[PDB]
Amino acid sequence: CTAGKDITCKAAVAWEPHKPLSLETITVAPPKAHEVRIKILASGICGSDSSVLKEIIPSKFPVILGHEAVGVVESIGAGVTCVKPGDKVIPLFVPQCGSCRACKSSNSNFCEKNDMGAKTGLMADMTSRFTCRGKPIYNLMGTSTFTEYTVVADIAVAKIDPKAPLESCLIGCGFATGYGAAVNTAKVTPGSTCAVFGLGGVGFSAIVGCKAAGASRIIGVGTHKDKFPKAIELGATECLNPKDYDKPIYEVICEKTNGGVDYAVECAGRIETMMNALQSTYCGSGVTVVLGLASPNERLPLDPLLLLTGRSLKGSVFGGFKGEEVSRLVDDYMKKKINVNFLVSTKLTLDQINKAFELLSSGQGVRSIMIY
């Protein structure tokens, strides 16, 4: 039994930015009050994890990344009632305290207890449960999944079906984000025309989302044509490679869609892709959703006239989903309403984690996950 005891396990540590993750032996302390220690079963590698390493997204170091996973509760701290040892769960990088303005609302999921703003990289009591070589290691958005065991607040966990597949880990971020961006944020309607920019994990999930919402046309826009067949299989009606064109991609799209698409979803994290997405929508009612994160000091040179005719520009985190909605997604996945496992193009071990980061730059595949 490991309850109430320190656990020694394997984890991928980021001692510094711009450097490959280091496989280390670490110590994971027992959960304190209102905390839950989880044995990670599978973890996905998200573009945001890569961005932290490139300093595109701020974070303290040393740090254990990863925020897309599925696991089983190993033990619970004092006062915990929402889960119990043995329950299968998905860590939430966007918690749900249930009492803040966002949580009490039905139009927001941005719980104020999130650490995306403060970036403390520590637990609620400002201490760390991670130790490596006698040094406290910071966590990522209250999760950290690039480790065999992690500890999270009891408001940052979603209990799910005990038999949920290991591929359910994508629901921890990438899939819920892209899927939700289409279904919740953009609010894609039946028969509408959509365009998705950036065919990575999130982008493919957005394509699946637009299809589920009933779009009549879904245009996948990316620079790696090897992904096109896959994109079509998952819902895209056609794909376009901006590099093939001399004329602006938004002009190409507007010419093909009677003036522009109804909904555009940006999933690359590039100011240029955001601008292309916006201008690819119909000026009279087009809706653009930005999901990607660009360098902190980059800005979108927005001409207000682009919005004046009737356009909308919005953004969201975790597809606008609240933690309490995660289980339902897992259910739909098992009922085959959504085949999340289709997005898993590569399965690796924790030791091969750096390969997943290498693939992120490759011109193929969708999502890589690790089975511990």
Ligand X SMILES: NC(=O)c1ccc[n+]([C@@H]2O[C@H](COP(=O)([O-])OP(=O)(O)OC[C@H]3O[C@@H](n4cnc5c(N)ncnc54)[C@H](OP(=O)(O)O)[C@@H]3O)[C@@H](O)[C@H]2O)c1
Task: Report what 258 binds from ligand X, Zn ion, a second copy, none; CB cut-off 5-8 Å by kind.
Answer: a second copy
Q: Is 3 in the site for a second copy (CB under 8 A)?
A: no
**What does each C-alpha distance from 78 to 84, 88, 157, 316, 323 come to in angstroms?**
12, 19, 16, 33, 22
How many residues lie near a second copy (CB under 8 A)?
43
Least distance in angstroms from the C-beta of 255 to a second copy: 14
Q: Is 118 in the site for a second copy (CB under 8 A)?
A: no
From the list 11-19, 136-144, 235-243, 280-288, the region that binds a second copy by CB under 8 A is 280-288
Which token pair is 168? Answer: 């359910």
From the list 28-36, 60-68, 233-241, 310-318, the region that binds a second copy by CB under 8 A is 310-318
Nearer to a second copy, 105 or 364 (CB): 105
Q: Is residue 239 annotated as involved in ligand binding? A: no
In the region spanning residues 199 to 258, those forming contacts with a second copy, defined by CB under 8 A, are 258
Whether residue 242 contacts residue 267, with contact meaning beta carbons closer than 8 Å, is answered with: no
Least distance in angstroms from the C-beta of 187 to Zn ion: 22
Task: Report what 59 binds from Zn ion, ligand X, a second copy, none; CB cut-off 5-8 Å by kind.
Answer: none
Q: Is 362 in the site for a second copy (CB under 8 A)?
A: no
Task: Report what 97 binds from ligand X, Zn ion, a second copy, none; CB cut-off 5-8 Å by kind.
Answer: Zn ion
Nearer to ligand X, 62 or 174 (CB): 174
CA 349, 352, 356, 359: dihedral to nearest 10 degrees?
A: -130
Whether residue 74 contacts residue 85, with contact meaning beta carbons closer than 8 Å, is answered with: yes
Binding mask 320-339 for a second copy (x = CB under 8 A): x-------------------
Q: Is 301 in the site for a second copy (CB under 8 A)?
A: yes
Helix axes 271-279, 249-256, angle to 10 degrees: 20
Binding interface with Zn ion (CB under 5 A)? 46, 48, 97, 100, 103, 111, 173
HSE, CB side, 13 Å, CA atoms: give it for residue 200: 24
Looking at residue 29, the DSSP 8-state letter turns out to be P
| Tokens 């279904």 -> residue | 183
How far apart CA 154 and CA 132 sit, in angstroms, is 24
Q: Which run of H or of E encompasses 38? A: strand 35-44
Task: Report what 310 binds from Zn ion, a second copy, ligand X, none; CB cut-off 5-8 Å by kind.
Answer: a second copy
Residues in the chain: 372
The closest of 265, 266, 269 to 295, measured between CA atoms, is 269
The closest of 67, 78, 70 to 30, measured between CA atoms, is 78
Q: Which run of H or of E encompasses 26? A: strand 22-28
Instruction: Kindly give, in sequence order, each residue whose CB lies less than 8 Å from that of residue 279, ignoring residues fewer than 6 positions away.
Output: 248, 250, 254, 260, 306
End-to-end CA distance of the chain: 19
Nearer to a second copy, 36 or 254 (CB): 254
Q: Is residue 224 annotated as involved in ligand binding? A: no
Least distance in angstroms from the C-beta of 250 to a second copy: 16
Of residues 26, 170, 207, 274, which one binds a second copy by CB under 8 A? Answer: 274
Nearer to ligand X, 30 or 174 (CB): 174
Looking at residue 56, the DSSP 8-state letter turns out to be S
CB-based burial of residue 125 (10 Å sphere; 0-12 exposed, 13-18 middle, 19+ buried)?
Answer: exposed
Nearer to ligand X, 72 or 293 (CB): 293
Q: Is residue 194 annotated as involved in ligand binding? A: no
Nearer to ligand X, 93 or 282 (CB): 93
Rg (CA), the chain: 20
Binding site for a second copy (CB under 8 A): 101-102, 105, 107-110, 116, 258-259, 271, 274, 282-285, 290-294, 296, 298-317, 320
Binding site for Zn(2+): residue ranges? Answer: 46, 67, 97, 100, 103, 111, 173
Binding site: residue ranges? Answer: 46, 67, 97, 100, 103, 111, 173
